[PDB]
Design a protein around this ligand. Structure first.
Ligand SMILES: [Mg+2]
Lengths: 199, 873, 56, 834
């Protein structure tokens, strides 16, 4: 150290992730990404969080344990479980590594039916309005609210800071209910500016 | 005794009080430590600039001073204090009541002699310790051994020996073992001074009957004997510049120099210091330079230099006499009058009983200068009649100054005791003026005043006649004759229209200077003694003979205030610059500050010595006083200038024994709301309403004209990845279930929780309270964020919240501003569902309150109906 | 900061802001001495006719 | 009446030095030449301290508690001031070129970079009373071999990093015991070191050199010691690093280059967040708010002050000031705003309270010489030496018309008719007064009759006659309006330079070259008064002069004058170091003010120091530009004979203290004087003076409170005025119940009516009791409207303030209430569907 040196809440929401042990089940579509991305997933977990990492091929789940003799941070197990789940939900690894690095990032989860009981084409057109052609509308929302959104069919996941994901939530719901696009893009301009301001 | 408005700051104009000064050398330069009563000042030998002063006044007067490199030792009563850079570092307290008299420091030993012929020795606890602190031993010289101790001196190359010099003889004490190694032979005449010579083993001894003895300690024998018949030696010093000279001071004030090699007198400097005040108290050669410093009890320090010999050969014989080089000085007796020369606190005029007027500078000591009394040549050509022997003018009883015409002609008038005319002075030239003003009624001068414009000087005679002269020519213009007794005060207002006079008859007359008419006449109960006129406020205070200060308003000619409490004469008094206080001194040894608005004494002081004069600075920062004792001026700082002062009347009885808060601090804070039904805006900046309404366009302007070009590879969450505080809405955390559009419980925002709780409690006062606290960007973000989807519960609640606020009649602009922003961001949603009962009912209630707040329109329209008409036609 | 050359044109003395003096042999370009640490940087150098090296 | 005091300095927002944010982040401290200005950004208020240095400020610093502010001028003289009380505690001379001063984050110590020594001192307690020697030395450090460019405190108040021109950064320990912790020297920079900083964990030290290199120092094995692990480089082509700041919490590095662009870097990743260009001039200083989100930038050359919200890419504050350039000023009719004209050709409107330029116009090619407002207040006119007179509309900021003479004549003075239908301008080359019709723009007529150049013009607000004065030693009164044109010349002893018209329109004052203010009666064309002014005027000896100030005849006359709106006072200014305020009826000097006390300006001193000469001459006349290290400082663009009208570089001579114009505030008892340093606004607002009116023994602060408790309001209010104390007036004002206001108002004695109207005006602008005030004003005007009408020029300033209050804040509020009322009715009444 330099001579000048100074002298279990789950971040993810909408789903219950929770010597202790934590198991995370990986769906089939994330196995191959997990395999090729496995090389970069265990080091931050084993090294920084000092957790024991196993994943069961038989049950296709990721198993984490707190090591009494090595682990030091009591929240490390839950942070580590949160980090794996983000990679499980569909977020890119670099975004998922943000959860480990920062202490104020939450994942908000909700379903289209929770907003409105839509079926058939109506549900399909609702997913379209969130995505937009070439993902422009989702692209607009993530930059403005400064979040990362994974639109897995009718399952929506929003990653970012608290107020950030509150506003990213409001844009998405207004798209589902069928608000005219002008509010969504037009108001997205204002929320982008107002958030970054000091006053 | 401790004022709540004023605190001592320093003494000005005091350079030495007669205690022998001490010389200390830092490298090449030399510094001189001088005593001023209860404090000491350090002067630089090169320029005689003031460097440092002791932080605090010692409890008792300083007796002896010795300096050694950075550290300076000052001895008062039984305590010896060590000072570095004027900061006390350590205090050596002796264990006996006997007062210390002499002080010697050689190496790591410190020697202090008490008046009971007891010598205390202190030593350094450690070899590299800076100053001696520990108590080593105690040596006492009995009457059998020798008489009283004259001084303690240490000769070079004497290992742990102290040369104690007594009236009877000289003794040699070995401090380490505390044994008397040697006692000198008895000397017939009482010894008064000792000095170690640059030669070895030889110490110069000054007797009471004009003998100087080069006594050789090693040989125990006399070497030489000077005779100075009919004299008393007070100081001695050798010249170390390579020429064998000796400077002998005498109590008569004469300094003599001898050439020891030639056995002859170089010169004598006569009356360098007054004989009355102790003459040459100290006179020391600087180590290895041709310059000799001298001091005396007359509050002066001088320096003399020996120039090189004019003869190319035999320079030793042809010795130039010493030449005055530089000096610093002050009054020899207490100042009689003071006055501020300038609007700023730079310069001070002081006149003393020593018949000299001085200009003292508060900002720097060097700038202080004496007013020369050399007279200008008469215009007529006649010879000016005066004694050929030059004698200073008599002391100055009264004085007046103006700066309207500084530099153009004379601007100061001074009156003298038992003198039938007033003399003029010029500040810019620092020299007496060319005009003399005569009373013209065979009467002495008792009052002097000047107009603000600097053109007229008023002189008040003891026989009741007021004369007016013109300053630029000194030609009499007018003469007023109302009083039949002595006039003791004159003043002219700022406008040079109304003039006021007061005399021992107790009468105050009001004259109109322009028309020369008597406006009115006022009689008081008792004789009047002095007057001060405050030009800004047109109030002037009279020190009546019944121990009362009477304030009178010149415009109306009536007594407005009368102050009582003084136990004796009022020697002097002054107004505060703002016109709100009067500080008066009296012979009961007190200074009382009177609050004119409330007419009571707010502060009181008890000074040890009566205060002859008190004068505020025109700025108001400083207050200066002069006292019956002490050659300097006491300067005080007006603590009121940095914080408020309570105006509660002082306790008279408690003061004698020593010898509604918003009224009390002369402030008032506006109520939040005068009355419930009265409209009121928010307690804050008025730009907040405008900023909220036009937030977007204001922001649009602010943006840079060209985009900032940024790196492609940038962290997405940089704002959040901030090592740690920002308080923005973006930096908010949830506080601890079915998904809800507004917020999932445990994940909702603070504002939403307040709204829902308010909706249940039917009281949104908490939500309205926090609404006002938000920043404008926060407010726009939240009103945006309201749920706009059926059943429209959030929007309906929000309208209820604002509607309740409008009933409060407080902050009604912000509520209006909020309800505008509600329409901006949710105008469409309200419009589509205007038939919905929940929205319509809330809107109707808001309108019902809002319809009431239309009286404000009527009032505003009426005033412009009349203000435009009244201002125009 | 400074350079000096003797009369013979055989030696050179250079001082730098790195608090170092270096004597050079300019006939063959070989460094002879390097007083690497000086108390403070040397502003000037000079060489006399007799060969005295002067430093300031 | 005549109790004016310096309040604030407009026209200049930054001159040189280092800008520092307040700890709370709501106030900005900017050195303006010889004084310090404080801007409260959030509340929209500002003020400039009354203390004055003797040279331009070189460094300032405010401790975190917000209680003590130290400002050090270029000579090293330091002045310690209590921020809360706005008074001077002490003055100190450090006897060197002090480069930077910084308070330790604990608040106990402050460090000085003076020459090659770092000096650490002990702060004096604010609560303690003043002493002879408040500062106590802690230590002096002497390790560097050249000047110290800048220093930085460690966050725990235990280490100071110093960066010198030695190509070296060095670290010290404030505690003697902890010296072994930090006694290292950092080397390896090719150029000067502009700044050295600590990381938040304080394990990494960043050093920046002028050439644009950033070194990251880490304590690591090659057994442990400091090393450069990473080096980042600024690839600016020729720009040099001028000012560097680091915010450890947010890892923000703001670097300002000499080319006038600045970069925000995220250390240690060296990711470029943003860079902008604020101009072609160097960025002299940069600062960071405590929270790390406002960045304040300063460029000395054009006097620009920029505050950048790098988060949102928004400008909180962007301002540019004038030095030596303000040629004129003109208050808005209501006193809201002040306009200024500069040789740059730019007309700027400044808001008095905030102190910021709210708009700028750049049409005029050459120097704008004077500006005047129409009586209405919407329209504005300005005349320039480019040969045009231009009309501006403030509602839409459009130059809705432009006038120009046929002969291409430069204009120096202008006047505008009260009806706003005729505009007249004068010239120093044509000897005639041109006239134009505002509506049409045609040259209505050229008025002739002057045998010398026209120096000033003015219309009579009532009679509508035109008074024109010339160097012809004459003044002419033109009755332009009416069927017959008439001219009535009145002769004068000497050249006439300025002119002021009585608001009644019955008399005119004229300042002559002899140093006289002569007042004439228009209808009778005979003199009514005279005031001598030569003796009052203070003029200094310039350094280049070869003759004394006393014998000098350079400026013993007043080049500008103006009446007080009450009509009883004249404020005068000239090419001199004094602003004099005379009283007309008694022809006496009410007070004299010193414009400046700076020795950077040429004309400040009457007597100059003898030491400055040698056999060559004055030391200060010696040009030492070549000593400046940078090329741009050495380069001289000066033209040999220029006197005015060009940049500071052109003239080659020191600016001269001079007051071009002066005016009284229409709505407040204050006056503004344009000078070289800027618009010095002197105001009487403070009112700590006790100026009672018609007291008796029975009146007392206690008695009035008793009169209130006993519900004798009319007496209580009246006794309040006789004492004439604001806090006492304010209390009695607010305690009168609403039912009793109309009764009290009808019974206020007429003599006190002006005082209450003034008080309501000053209180109402910033007070919160709007409906309470409007109830009072409704009462007063209804009761005593007839009296106010009969004596207009006594109540004019008071009446304008009330109209200002009711048109700015009362009307703005009702305008926002009424529009909601219609926005409400539209939403409910109409039908919304589909
Ligand atoms: Mg006719």
């Amino acid at each position: 150290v330099a001579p000048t040196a100074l002298k279990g809440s789950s971040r993810i929401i909408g789903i219950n992730n929770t010597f202790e042990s934590r198991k995370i089940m990986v769906p089939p579509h994330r196995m191959t990404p997990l395999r090729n991305s496995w090389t970069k997933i265990y080091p931050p977990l084993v090294e920084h969080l000092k957790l024991q990492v196993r994943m069961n091929l038989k049950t296709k789940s990721v198993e984490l344990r707190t090591n009494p003799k090595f682990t030091t941070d009591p929240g490390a197990l839950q942070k580590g479980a949160d980090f794996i789940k983000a990679f499980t939900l569909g977020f890119d690894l670099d975004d998922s590594i943000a959860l480990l690095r920062l202490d104020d990032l939450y994942i908000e989860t909700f379903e289209v039916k929770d907003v409105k009981t839509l079926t058939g084409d109506h549900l399909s057109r609702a997913i379209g309005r969130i995505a937009g052609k070439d993902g422009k509308t989702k692209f607009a929302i993530e930059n403005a609210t400064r979040t990362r959104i994974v639109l897995a069919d009718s399952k929506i996941h929003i990653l970012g800071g608290f107020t950030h994901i509150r506003m990213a939530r409001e844009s998405v719901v207004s798209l589902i209910l069928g608000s005219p696009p002008g509010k969504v893009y037009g108001n997205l301009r204002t929320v982008a500016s107002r958030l970054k301001e000091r006053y | 005794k401790n004022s709540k408005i004023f605190s001592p700051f320093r003494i000005i104009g005091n350079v030495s009080n007669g205690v022998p000064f001490a010389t200390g050398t830092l490298g090449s330069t030399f510094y001189i430590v001088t005593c001023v009563g209860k404090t000491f000042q350090i002067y630089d030998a090169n320029t005689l600039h003031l460097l440092f002063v002791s932080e605090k006044e010692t409890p008792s007067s300083i007796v002896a001073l010795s300096a050694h490199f950075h550290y300076v030792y000052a001895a008062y009563e039984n305590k010896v204090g060590i000072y570095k850079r004027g900061i006390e570092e350590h205090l050596l307290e002796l264990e006996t009541d006997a007062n210390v008299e002499h002080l010697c420091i050689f190496g790591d030993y410190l020697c202090a002699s008490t008046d009971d012929n007891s010598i205390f020795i202190y030593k350094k606890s450690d070899p590299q310790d800076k100053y001696p602190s520990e108590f080593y031993t105690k040596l006492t010289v009995t009457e059998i051994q020798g008489g009283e101790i004259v001084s303690l001196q240490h000769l070079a190359t004497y290992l742990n020996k102290l040369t104690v010099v007594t009236k009877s003889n000289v003794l040699l004490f070995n401090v380490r073992t505390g044994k008397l190694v040697f006692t000198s032979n008895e000397f017939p005449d009482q010894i008064t001074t000792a000095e170690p010579a640059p030669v070895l083993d030889i110490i110069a001894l000054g007797t009471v009957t004009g003998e100087v003895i080069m006594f050789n300690m090693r040989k125990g024998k006399r070497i030489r004997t000077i005779k100075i018949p009919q004299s008393r030696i007070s100081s001695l010093s050798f010249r170390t510049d390579g020429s064998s000279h000796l400077s002998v001071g005498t109590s008569s004030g004469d300094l003599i120099f001898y050439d020891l090699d030639r056995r002859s007198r170089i010169h004598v400097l006569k009356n360098i210091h007054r004989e009355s005040y102790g003459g040459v108290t100290q006179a020391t050669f600087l180590n290895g330079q041709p310059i000799i410093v001298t001091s005396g009890g007359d509050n002066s320090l001088k320096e003399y230099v020996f120039d090189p010999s004019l003869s190319q050969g035999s320079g030793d014989v042809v010795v130039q006499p010493p030449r005055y080089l530089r000096s610093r000085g002050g009054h020899s007796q207490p100042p009689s009058y003071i006055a501020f020369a300038d609007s700023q606190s730079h310069f001070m005029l002081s006149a003393s009983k020593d018949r000299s007027l001085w200009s003292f500078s508060l900002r720097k000591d060097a700038q202080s200068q004496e007013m020369s009394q050399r007279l200008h040549k008469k215009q007529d050509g006649g010879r000016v009649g005066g004694s050929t022997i030059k004698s200073k003018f008599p002391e100055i009883v009264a004085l007046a100054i103006e700066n309207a015409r500084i530099g153009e002609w004379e601007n100061i008038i001074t009156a003298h005791k038992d003198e039938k005319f007033a003399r003029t002075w010029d500040m810019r030239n620092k020299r007496v003026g060319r005009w003399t003003f005569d009373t013209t009624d065979d009467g002495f001068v008792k009052s002097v005043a000047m107009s603000q414009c600097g053109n007229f000087g008023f002189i008040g005679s003891s026989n009741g006649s007021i004369t007016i002269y013109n300053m630029q020519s000194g030609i009499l213009r007018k003469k007023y004759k109302l009083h039949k007794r002595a006039v003791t005060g004159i003043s002219l207002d700022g406008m040079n229209r109304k003039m006021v006079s007061c005399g021992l008859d107790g009468i105050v007359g009001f004259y109109d200077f322009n028309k020369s008419t008597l406006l009115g006449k006022l009689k008081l109960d008792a004789p009047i003694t002095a007057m001060v006129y405050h030009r800004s406020s047109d109030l002037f205070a009279l020190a009546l003979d019944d121990l009362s200060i009477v304030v009178i308003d010149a415009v109306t000619q009536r007594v407005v205030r009368q102050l009582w409490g003084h136990s004796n004469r009022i020697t002097a008094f002054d107004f505060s610059p703002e016109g709100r206080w009067i500080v008066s001194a009296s012979l009961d040894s007190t200074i009382r500050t009177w609050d004119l608005p409330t007419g009571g004494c707010i502060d009181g002081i008890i000074v040890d010595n009566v205060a002859t004069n008190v004068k505020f600075s025109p700025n108001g920062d400083l207050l200066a006083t002069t006292h019956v004792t002490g050659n300097g001026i006491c300067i005080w700082t007006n603590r009121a200038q940095f914080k408020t002062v309570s105006t509660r009347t002082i306790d008279e009885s408690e003061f004698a024994r020593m010898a509604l808060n918003d009224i009390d601090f002369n402030t008032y804070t506006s109520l939040e709301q005068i009355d419930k039904e009265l409209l009121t805006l928010s307690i804050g900046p008025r730009s907040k309403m405008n900023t909220l309404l036009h937030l977007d366009v204001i922001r649009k302007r602010s943006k840079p004209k060209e985009a900032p070009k940024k790196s492609e590879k940038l962290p997405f969450f940089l704002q959040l990845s901030g090592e740690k505080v920002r308080e923005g809405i973006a930096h908010e955390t949830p506080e601890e279930n079915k998904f809800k559009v507004t917020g999932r419980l445990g994940f909702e925002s603070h504002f939403t929780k307040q709204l829902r709780e308010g909706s249940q409690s039917k009281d949104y006062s908490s939500l309205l309270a926090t609404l006002i606290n938000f920043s404008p960007a926060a407010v726009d973000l939240e009103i945006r964020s309201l749920n706009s989807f059926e059943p429209f519960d959030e929007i309906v609640w929000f309208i209820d919240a604002l509607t309740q606020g409008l009933k409060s009649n407080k902050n009604f602009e912000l509520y209006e501003t909020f309800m505008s922003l509600l329409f901006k961001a949710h105008g469409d949603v309200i419009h589509a569902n205007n038939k919905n009962q929940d929205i319509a009912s809330a809107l109707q209630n808001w309108e019902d309150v809002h319809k009431k707040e239309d009286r404000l329109d009527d009032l505003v329209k009426f005033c412009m109906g009349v203000a435009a008409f009244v201002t125009t036609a | 900061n400074s350079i000096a050359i003797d009369r013979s044109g055989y030696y050179m003395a250079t001082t730098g802001a790195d608090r170092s003096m270096k004597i050079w042999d300019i006939r063959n370009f070989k460094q002879l001495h390097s007083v690497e640490s000086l108390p403070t940087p040397g502003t000037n150098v000079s060489i006399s006719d007799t060969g005295l090296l002067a430093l300031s | 009446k005549s109790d004016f005091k310096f309040s604030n300095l407009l026209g200049t927002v930054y001159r040189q030095g280092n800008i520092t944010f307040s700890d709370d982040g709501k106030q900005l401290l900017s050195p303006v030449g010889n004084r310090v200005s404080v801007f409260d950004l959030i509340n929209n208020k500002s003020f400039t301290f009354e203390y004055e240095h003797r040279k331009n400020i070189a460094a300032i610093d405010l401790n975190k508690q917000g209680t003590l502010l130290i400002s050090i001028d270029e000579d090293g003289r330091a002045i310690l001031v209590n921020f809360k009380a706005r008074n001077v505690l002490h003055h100190f001379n450090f006897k060197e070129k002090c480069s930077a001063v910084k308070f330790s984050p604990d608040g106990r110590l402050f460090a000085l970079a003076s020459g090659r020594f770092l000096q650490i001192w002990k702060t004096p307690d604010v609560n303690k009373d003043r002493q002879f020697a408040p500062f106590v030395r802690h230590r002096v450090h002497a390790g560097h071999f050249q000047d110290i460019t800048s220093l930085t405190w460690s966050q725990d108040s235990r280490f100071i990093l110093t960066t010198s021109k030695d190509l070296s950064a060095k670290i010290w320990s404030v505690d003697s015991e902890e010296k072994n912790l930090a006694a290292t020297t950092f080397n390896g920079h090719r150029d000067y070191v502009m700044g050295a900083f600590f990381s938040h964990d304080q394990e990494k030290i960043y050093t920046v050199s002028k050439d644009g290199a950033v070194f990251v120092w880490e304590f690591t094995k090659r057994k442990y010691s400091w090393r450069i692990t990473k080096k980042h480089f600024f690839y600016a082509n020729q720009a040099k690093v001028k000012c560097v700041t680091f915010h450890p919490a947010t890892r923000l590095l703001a670097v300002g280059f000499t080319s006038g662009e600045f970069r925000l870097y995220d250390l240690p990743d060296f990711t470029l967040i943003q860079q902008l260009s604020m101009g072609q001039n160097p960025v002299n200083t940069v600062s960071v708010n405590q929270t790390g989100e406002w960045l304040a930038f300063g460029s000395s050359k054009l006097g620009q002050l920029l505050v950048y919200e790098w988060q949102s890419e928004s400008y909180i504050l962007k301002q540019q000031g004038h030095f030596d350039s303000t040629n004129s000023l003109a208050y808005s009719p209501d006193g809201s705003r002040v306009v200024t004209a500069s040789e740059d050709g730019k007309i700027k409107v400044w808001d008095i309270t905030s102190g910021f330029c709210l708009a700028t116009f750049e049409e005029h090619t050459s120097s704008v010489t004077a500006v005047q407002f129409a009586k209405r207040g919407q329209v504005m006119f300005s005349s320039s030496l480019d040969g045009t007179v231009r009309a501006w509309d403030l509602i839409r900021y459009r130059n809705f018309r432009t006038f120009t003479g046929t002969e291409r004549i430069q204009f120096n003075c202008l006047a505008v008719d009260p009806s706003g239908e005729v505009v007249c301008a004068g010239s120093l080359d044509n000897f005639d007064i041109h006239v134009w019709s505002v509506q049409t723009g045609q040259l209505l007529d050229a008025l002739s009759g002057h045998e010398g150049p026209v120096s000033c013009l003015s219309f009579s607000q009532e009679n509508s006659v035109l008074a024109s004065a010339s160097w012809d030693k004459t003044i002419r009164i033109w009755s332009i309006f009416g069927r017959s044109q008439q001219v009535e010349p009145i002769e004068v002893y000497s050249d006439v330079l300025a002119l002021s018209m009585r608001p009644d329109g019955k008399e005119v004052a004229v300042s002559t070259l002899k140093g006289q203010i002569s007042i004439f009666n228009i209808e009778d064309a005979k003199q009514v008064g005279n005031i001598d002014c030569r003796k009052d005027i203070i003029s200094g000896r310039f350094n280049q002069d070869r003759f004394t100030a006393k014998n000098s005849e350079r400026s013993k006359f007043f080049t500008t004058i103006h009446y007080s709106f009450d009509g009883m006072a004249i404020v005068a200014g000239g090419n001199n170091n004094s602003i004099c305020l005379y009283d007309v009826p008694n022809e006496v000097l009410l007070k004299r003010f010193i414009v400046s006390r700076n020795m950077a300006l040429n004309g400040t001193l009457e007597f100059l120091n003898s030491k400055k000469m040698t056999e060559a001459g004055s030391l200060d006349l010696i040009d030492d530009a070549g000593e400046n290290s940078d090329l741009e400082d050495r380069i001289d663009n000066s033209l040999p004979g220029s006197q005015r009208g060009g940049d500071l570089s052109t003239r080659k001579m020191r600016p001269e203290v001079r007051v071009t114009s002066v005016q009284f505030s229409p709505t407040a008892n204050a006056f503004a004087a344009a000078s070289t340093e800027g618009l010095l606004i002197y105001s009487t607002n403070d009112t700590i003076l006790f100026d009672p009116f018609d007291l008796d023994v029975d009146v007392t602060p206690h008695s009035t409170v008793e009169a209130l408790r006993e519900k004798q309001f009319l007496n209580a209010l009246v006794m309040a005025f006789r004492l004439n104390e604001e806090y006492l007036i304010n209390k009695v004002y607010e305690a009168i119940p609403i039912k009793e206001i109309p009764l009290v108002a009808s019974n206020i004695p007429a003599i006190y009516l002006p005082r209450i109207l003034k008080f309501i005006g000053d209180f109402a602008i910033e007070s919160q009791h709007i409906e309470f005030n409007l109830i009072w004003i409704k009462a007063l005007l209804s009761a005593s409207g007839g009296y106010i009408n009969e004596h207009k020029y006594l109540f004019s300033t008071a009446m304008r303030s009330i109209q200002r209050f009711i048109v700015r804040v009362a009307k703005e509020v009702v305008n926002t209430t009424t529009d909601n009322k219609y926005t409400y009715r539209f939403l409910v009444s109409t039908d919304g569907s589909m």
